[PDB]
Design an enzyme around this catalytic site. Structure first.
Site, PDB file in Angstrom:
ATOM      1  N   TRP A  71       0.832  -1.213   0.000  1.00 49.75           N
ATOM      2  CA  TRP A  71       0.000   0.000   0.000  1.00 49.75           C
ATOM      3  C   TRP A  71       0.871   1.271   0.000  1.00 49.75           C
ATOM      4  O   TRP A  71       0.480   2.309  -0.577  1.00 49.75           O
ATOM      5  CB  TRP A  71      -0.945   0.060   1.198  1.00 49.75           C
ATOM      6  CG  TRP A  71      -2.057  -0.934   1.246  1.00 49.75           C
ATOM      7  CD1 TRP A  71      -2.025  -2.165   1.844  1.00 49.75           C
ATOM      8  CD2 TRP A  71      -3.389  -0.765   0.755  1.00 49.75           C
ATOM      9  NE1 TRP A  71      -3.246  -2.781   1.734  1.00 49.75           N
ATOM     10  CE2 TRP A  71      -4.103  -1.947   1.069  1.00 49.75           C
ATOM     11  CE3 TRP A  71      -4.059   0.275   0.076  1.00 49.75           C
ATOM     12  CZ2 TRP A  71      -5.450  -2.132   0.714  1.00 49.75           C
ATOM     13  CZ3 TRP A  71      -5.405   0.104  -0.269  1.00 49.75           C
ATOM     14  CH2 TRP A  71      -6.080  -1.096   0.042  1.00 49.75           C
ATOM     15  N   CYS A  96       0.018  -8.575   5.768  1.00 55.79           N
ATOM     16  CA  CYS A  96       1.432  -8.432   6.082  1.00 55.79           C
ATOM     17  C   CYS A  96       2.181  -9.752   6.348  1.00 55.79           C
ATOM     18  O   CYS A  96       3.400  -9.855   6.069  1.00 55.79           O
ATOM     19  CB  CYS A  96       1.609  -7.437   7.208  1.00 55.79           C
ATOM     20  SG  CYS A  96       1.293  -5.836   6.591  1.00 55.79           S
ATOM     21  N   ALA A 232     -13.027  -2.221   0.615  1.00 56.26           N
ATOM     22  CA  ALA A 232     -14.093  -1.701   1.465  1.00 56.26           C
ATOM     23  C   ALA A 232     -13.918  -0.200   1.634  1.00 56.26           C
ATOM     24  O   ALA A 232     -12.788   0.291   1.776  1.00 56.26           O
ATOM     25  CB  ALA A 232     -14.063  -2.358   2.786  1.00 56.26           C
ATOM     26  N   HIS A 466       6.127  -2.800  12.870  1.00 54.66           N
ATOM     27  CA  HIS A 466       5.111  -3.352  13.750  1.00 54.66           C
ATOM     28  C   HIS A 466       4.139  -2.305  14.302  1.00 54.66           C
ATOM     29  O   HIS A 466       4.055  -2.087  15.519  1.00 54.66           O
ATOM     30  CB  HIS A 466       5.769  -4.180  14.845  1.00 54.66           C
ATOM     31  CG  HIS A 466       6.906  -5.014  14.359  1.00 54.66           C
ATOM     32  ND1 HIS A 466       7.942  -5.405  15.177  1.00 54.66           N
ATOM     33  CD2 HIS A 466       7.191  -5.506  13.131  1.00 54.66           C
ATOM     34  CE1 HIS A 466       8.803  -6.124  14.481  1.00 54.66           C
ATOM     35  NE2 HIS A 466       8.373  -6.195  13.236  1.00 54.66           N
ATOM     36  N   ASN A 512       3.651 -10.678  14.614  1.00 55.00           N
ATOM     37  CA  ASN A 512       2.793 -11.448  13.688  1.00 55.00           C
ATOM     38  C   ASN A 512       2.045 -12.606  14.375  1.00 55.00           C
ATOM     39  O   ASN A 512       0.811 -12.624  14.483  1.00 55.00           O
ATOM     40  CB  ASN A 512       3.637 -11.930  12.498  1.00 55.00           C
ATOM     41  CG  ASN A 512       2.868 -12.787  11.483  1.00 55.00           C
ATOM     42  OD1 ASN A 512       3.292 -13.904  11.198  1.00 55.00           O
ATOM     43  ND2 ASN A 512       1.793 -12.254  10.890  1.00 55.00           N
TER      44      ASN A 512
HETATM   45  C1  LIG Z   1       4.887  -5.422   6.571  1.00 55.37           C
HETATM   46  C2  LIG Z   1       6.107  -5.786   7.467  1.00 55.37           C
HETATM   47  C3  LIG Z   1       5.673  -6.288   8.684  1.00 55.37           C
HETATM   48  C4  LIG Z   1       6.371  -7.311   9.298  1.00 55.37           C
HETATM   49  C5  LIG Z   1       7.663  -7.662   8.868  1.00 55.37           C
HETATM   50  C6  LIG Z   1       8.176  -7.062   7.708  1.00 55.37           C
HETATM   51  C7  LIG Z   1       7.393  -6.127   7.000  1.00 55.37           C
HETATM   52  C8  LIG Z   1       7.933  -5.466   5.749  1.00 55.37           C
HETATM   53  N1  LIG Z   1       8.364  -8.687   9.521  1.00 55.37           N
HETATM   54  C9  LIG Z   1       7.760  -9.365  10.571  1.00 55.37           C
HETATM   55  C10 LIG Z   1       8.342 -10.490  11.142  1.00 55.37           C
HETATM   56  O1  LIG Z   1       9.392 -10.954  10.733  1.00 55.37           O
HETATM   57  N2  LIG Z   1       7.726 -11.122  12.190  1.00 55.37           N
HETATM   58  C11 LIG Z   1       6.589 -10.604  12.754  1.00 55.37           C
HETATM   59  O2  LIG Z   1       6.172 -11.083  13.798  1.00 55.37           O
HETATM   60  N3  LIG Z   1       5.985  -9.505  12.196  1.00 55.37           N
HETATM   61  C12 LIG Z   1       6.507  -8.947  11.046  1.00 55.37           C
HETATM   62  N4  LIG Z   1       5.820  -7.920  10.405  1.00 55.37           N
HETATM   63  C13 LIG Z   1       4.636  -7.301  11.061  1.00 55.37           C
HETATM   64  C14 LIG Z   1       3.485  -8.274  10.995  1.00 55.37           C
HETATM   65  O3  LIG Z   1       3.596  -8.903   9.741  1.00 55.37           O
HETATM   66  C15 LIG Z   1       2.199  -7.486  11.149  1.00 55.37           C
HETATM   67  O4  LIG Z   1       2.228  -6.795  12.373  1.00 55.37           O
HETATM   68  C16 LIG Z   1       0.982  -8.372  11.097  1.00 55.37           C
HETATM   69  O5  LIG Z   1       1.022  -8.905   9.817  1.00 55.37           O
HETATM   70  C17 LIG Z   1      -0.287  -7.544  11.210  1.00 55.37           C
HETATM   71  O6  LIG Z   1      -1.411  -8.229  10.711  1.00 55.37           O
HETATM   72  P1  LIG Z   1      -2.851  -7.518  10.723  1.00 55.37           P
HETATM   73  O7  LIG Z   1      -3.924  -8.554  10.611  1.00 55.37           O
HETATM   74  O8  LIG Z   1      -3.086  -6.642  11.933  1.00 55.37           O
HETATM   75  O9  LIG Z   1      -2.887  -6.600   9.428  1.00 55.37           O
HETATM   76  P2  LIG Z   1      -2.505  -7.097   7.957  1.00 55.37           P
HETATM   77  O10 LIG Z   1      -1.686  -8.346   7.975  1.00 55.37           O
HETATM   78  O11 LIG Z   1      -1.781  -5.931   7.296  1.00 55.37           O
HETATM   79  O12 LIG Z   1      -3.963  -7.332   7.304  1.00 55.37           O
HETATM   80  C18 LIG Z   1      -4.778  -6.324   6.747  1.00 55.37           C
HETATM   81  C19 LIG Z   1      -5.285  -6.842   5.411  1.00 55.37           C
HETATM   82  O13 LIG Z   1      -6.467  -6.192   4.985  1.00 55.37           O
HETATM   83  C20 LIG Z   1      -6.282  -5.603   3.699  1.00 55.37           C
HETATM   84  N5  LIG Z   1      -6.948  -4.311   3.622  1.00 55.37           N
HETATM   85  C21 LIG Z   1      -6.471  -3.108   4.076  1.00 55.37           C
HETATM   86  N6  LIG Z   1      -7.430  -2.186   3.809  1.00 55.37           N
HETATM   87  C22 LIG Z   1      -8.490  -2.762   3.174  1.00 55.37           C
HETATM   88  C23 LIG Z   1      -9.720  -2.272   2.696  1.00 55.37           C
HETATM   89  N7  LIG Z   1     -10.058  -0.975   2.847  1.00 55.37           N
HETATM   90  N8  LIG Z   1     -10.618  -3.146   2.104  1.00 55.37           N
HETATM   91  C24 LIG Z   1     -10.285  -4.465   1.985  1.00 55.37           C
HETATM   92  N9  LIG Z   1      -9.078  -4.937   2.478  1.00 55.37           N
HETATM   93  C25 LIG Z   1      -8.192  -4.106   3.059  1.00 55.37           C
HETATM   94  C26 LIG Z   1      -4.785  -5.439   3.503  1.00 55.37           C
HETATM   95  O14 LIG Z   1      -4.382  -5.466   2.140  1.00 55.37           O
HETATM   96  C27 LIG Z   1      -4.247  -6.602   4.329  1.00 55.37           C
HETATM   97  O15 LIG Z   1      -4.222  -7.752   3.527  1.00 55.37           O
END
Ligand SMILES: *Cc1cc2c(cc1C)nc1c(=O)[nH]c(=O)nc-1n2C[C@H](O)[C@H](O)[C@H](O)COP(=O)(O)OP(=O)(O)OC[C@H]1O[C@@H](n2cnc3c(N)ncnc32)[C@H](O)[C@@H]1O
Length: 530
Positions: A71, A96, A232, A466, A512
Site C-alpha cells: 500500500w 502483512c 471496502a 510493527h 505477527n
Molecule cells: C509489513 C512488514 C511487517 C512485518 C515484517 C516485515 C514487514 C515489511 N516482519 C515481521 C516479522 O518478521 N515477524 C513478525 O512477527 N511480524 C513482522 N511484520 C509485522 C506483521 O507482519 C504485522 O504486524 C501483522 O502482519 C499484522 O497483521 P494484521 O492482521 O493486523 O494486518 P494485515 O496483515 O496488514 O492485514 C490487513 C489486510 O487487509 C487488507 N486491507 C487493508 N485495507 C483494506 C480495505 N479498505 N478493504 C479491503 N481490504 C483491506 C490489507 O491489504 C491486508 O491484507
C-alpha cells in the site's frame, strides 16, 4: 469458492463478513468457517497469493517493499524523527504475513498478562493465549519435552538452521559480551539472550502466511467465500445501530456493492486501515469527523489514537570476508538484552542482517558496500504515542500516519536506541568477530557523543514494521478504548475488530504470530454465542 469479479456473486448475504484477509483476518475467517451450517465471506483489497511467487517464496520478501503488493504509506513530517520513512503494508491475501520476514515469536507471558491486570482487557492473559499459540502452530520443537507446543496446527514454525558463519560468530561474540544463547518460544521470556530465530516457513521455502496456512486449504469449502481485489470503503448500520454489512469497490473509480451480514462483521484491515475505515464509517473522535464532513455515528475519541511501533536504528559494517549468498530471510538472528536493572522483559532488541541496509543512510551520504552486515536495535516498548488520521473523506486518499517517534517526554526511546547502537558496536568489536567485522559505515566511528548519535538516529532510523494499538481494547468504563474485552466496537452492535489495532500495549517481540493468535481468540469469542 473464489470470486475475482463481484458480478459472479448472486448472494451477497452472509452470516459473517470478515474484512481484510491478513494475519488475523484469514485466521478468523478460516476458524469461523469450521461450522458448515454458518456461512463466511472474507473480503480483501489485494489479489490472491496462489501462483504469485514474489509473495509465496520467503527469501524474496524484501523485493515486495514499494511494489504493487505494498500500500506504501509514508509518514507525516516528524518533530524528532526521519521524515523519509515509509510504513510498508502488504496488499494481497495473508496481508502483512505475506510480505513479512516470517520471524516467529510467542509473546512473553508478562506482556499478555498485563493486558488484563494493567490495561483492563478482562480475559486477555497467558492462560488464554497459550492454548491458541498451541493450536495455530505445527512447531519443530513440539514433543513431550515441550508440551506447550502444538504439533498439528496450520502455521508451520521451523528452526532456522545455524549455517551462516558470521551468524555463528556473532553469537560467539554475544556470549563474550554477556549475552547467552537462548532457545526461543519455550514459554520462558528471553531477557538477556540471542539465537537464530524460529520462522513460520514450510519445508519447501514457501512462507507460512495466514493465507497459505488458513485459507488455501479451505478455498473450495461449501460455506466459505473468498472475494479478492475488492476494497471496502464503508461500514453500514441500522436505525438500531446494528452493523448490517459493508460497501465495497471493484477498482477505486468502479462501482459500489453491498455485502450484508446476518450475524457479524469483523474488521481486520490492520493498524493503519482499520481506524481509517471506522472513521469513514462514522466511528471516531467527533471533532475530527466534523472536520471532514463525516456524520458521527459514535463519538469514540480513541480510534486512530495510541499508535505504537518498534522504532529501529541501524549500524552497518563492511565484512572482511565474503557474506552468505543464500539465506532463509537475510535477518536470521535476534538479540535481547536489558539496558536497566529490574525488568522482566528486555527493553532493547537487535536483529542481525547478512546484508547492508542503506535504505535510510544513502540519502545522507553514508558510504555503502555490497559485502557487509547490519545490526538493527529497536525499542521493544517505546513510550512515544502517535495517530492515524484521515487526510480527507475520500476512501482513496492515504491516511495521515504520525507515529511521533522519540517524542516521549522522558526521552526514553532515544536513550534505549542510543544504548542499542553502543551495544551493537560492542558485540561486533568482540574477538569472536575479529575475522569479520570491518569498517563501520553508519553512523561511522566518527559519531561518539550522545548528541552525535541522536542526530544519526533522527535522520536514519527505520521501523521494524510493527504498527499497533490504533483501535484498542480496554475496560468498558474507559472512554479511550474503542473496543471492549470481547473485541466489540462500543456504541454499535454486530461489529468487532480483530488485528494489530487492538493491542493495549505493544508486545516485546515481532508481533505477527501474536496477531494470528488474536484472530483465533476472536473466532472463539464470536462462536461462543452460543
Ligand atoms: C509489513 C512488514 C511487517 C512485518 C515484517 C516485515 C514487514 C515489511 N516482519 C515481521 C516479522 O518478521 N515477524 C513478525 O512477527 N511480524 C513482522 N511484520 C509485522 C506483521 O507482519 C504485522 O504486524 C501483522 O502482519 C499484522 O497483521 P494484521 O492482521 O493486523 O494486518 P494485515 O496483515 O496488514 O492485514 C490487513 C489486510 O487487509 C487488507 N486491507 C487493508 N485495507 C483494506 C480495505 N479498505 N478493504 C479491503 N481490504 C483491506 C490489507 O491489504 C491486508 O491484507
Amino acid at each position: 469458492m473464489h470470486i475475482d469479479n463481484i458480478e459472479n456473486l448472486s448472494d451477497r448475504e452472509f452470516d459473517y463478513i470478515v474484512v481484510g484477509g491478513g494475519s488475523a483476518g484469514a485466521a478468523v475467517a478460516a476458524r469461523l468457517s469450521e461450522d458448515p451450517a454458518v456461512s463466511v465471506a472474507l473480503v480483501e483489497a489485494g489479489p490472491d497469493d496462489r501462483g504469485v511467487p514474489e509473495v509465496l517464496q520467503l527469501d524474496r520478501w524484501m523485493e515486495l517493499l514499494e511494489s504493487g503488493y505494498d500500500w506504501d504509506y509514508p509518514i507525516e513530517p516528524q518533530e524528532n524523527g526521519n521524515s523519509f520513512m515509509r510504513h510498508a503494508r502488504a496488499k494481497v491475501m495473508g496481508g502483512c504475513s505475506s510480505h513479512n520476514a516470517c520471524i516467529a515469536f510467542w509473546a512473553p507471558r508478562e506482556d499478555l498478562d498485563e493486558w488484563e491486570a494493567k490495561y483492563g482487557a478482562t480475559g486477555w492473559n497467558a492462560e488464554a493465549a497459550w492454548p491458541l499459540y498451541k493450536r495455530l502452530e505445527t512447531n519443530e520443537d513440539a514433543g513431550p519435552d515441550a508440551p506447550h507446543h502444538g504439533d498439528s496446527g496450520p502455521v508451520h514454525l521451523m528452526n532456522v538452521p545455524p549455517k551462516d558463519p558470521t551468524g555463528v560468530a556473532l553469537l560467539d561474540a554475544c556470549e563474550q559480551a554477556g549475552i547467552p544463547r537462548a532457545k526461543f518460544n519455550t514459554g520462558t521470556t528471553v531477557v538477556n539472550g540471542a539465537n537464530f530465530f524460529q520462522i513460520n516457513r514450510r519445508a519447501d521455502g514457501t512462507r507460512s502466511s495466514s493465507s497459505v496456512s488458513y485459507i488455501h486449504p479451505i478455498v473450495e469449502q461449501e460455506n466459505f467465500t473468498l472475494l479478492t481485489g475488492l476494497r471496502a470503503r464503508q461500514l453500514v448500520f441500522d436505525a438500531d445501530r446494528r452493523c448490517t454489512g459493508v460497501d465495497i469497490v471493484d477498482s477505486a473509480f468502479g462501482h459500489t456493492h453491498r455485502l450484508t451480514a446476518r450475524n457479524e462483521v469483523v474488521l481486520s484491515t490492520g493498524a493503519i486501515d482499520t481506524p481509517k475505515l471506522l472513521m469513514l464509517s462514522g466511528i471516531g473522535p467527533a471533532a475530527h469527523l466534523a472536520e471532514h464532513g463525516i456524520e458521527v455515528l459514535v463519538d469514540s475519541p480513541g480510534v486512530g489514537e495510541h499508535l505504537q511501533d518498534h522504532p529501529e536504528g541501524v549500524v552497518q559494517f563492511e565484512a572482511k570476508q565474503p557474506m552468505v549468498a543464500e539465506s532463509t530471510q537475510w535477518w536470521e538472528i535476534g538479540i535481547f538484552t536489558p539496558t536497566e536493572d529490574g525488568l522482566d522483559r528486555p527493553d532493547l532488541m537487535m536483529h542481525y542482517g547478512s546484508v547492508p541496509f542503506d535504505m535510510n543512510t544513502l540519502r545522507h551520504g553514508y558510504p555503502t558496500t555490497e559485502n557487509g552486515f547490519s545490526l538493527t536495535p529497536n525499542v521493544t516498548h517505546a513510550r512515544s504515542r502517535g495517530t492515524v488520521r484521515l487526510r480527507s473523506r475520500d476512501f482513496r486518499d492515504k491516511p495521515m500516519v504520525d507515529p511521533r517517534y522519540f517524542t516521549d517526554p522522558e526521552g526514553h526511546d532515544m536513550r534505549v536506541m542510543v544504548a542499542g547502537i553502543r551495544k551493537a558496536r560492542e558485540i561486533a568489536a568482540q574477538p569472536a568477530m575479529a575475522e569479520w567485522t570491518g569498517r563501520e559505515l553508519s553512523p561511522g566511528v566518527e559519531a561518539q557523543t550522545d548528541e552525535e548519535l541522536q542526530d544519526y538516529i533522527r535522520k536514519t532510523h527505520n521501523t521494524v514494521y510493527h504498527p499497533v494499538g490504533t483501535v484498542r481494547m480496554g475496560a468498558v468504563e474507559d472512554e479511550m478504548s474503542p473496543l471492549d474485552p470481547e473485541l466489540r466496537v462500543k456504541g454499535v452492535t454486530g461489529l468487532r475488530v480483530a488485528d494489530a489495532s487492538v493491542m493495549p500495549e505493544h508486545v516485546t517481540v515481532n508481533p505477527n504470530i501474536t496477531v494470528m493468535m488474536i484472530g483465533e481468540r476472536c473466532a472463539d469469542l464470536i462462536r461462543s454465542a452460543r
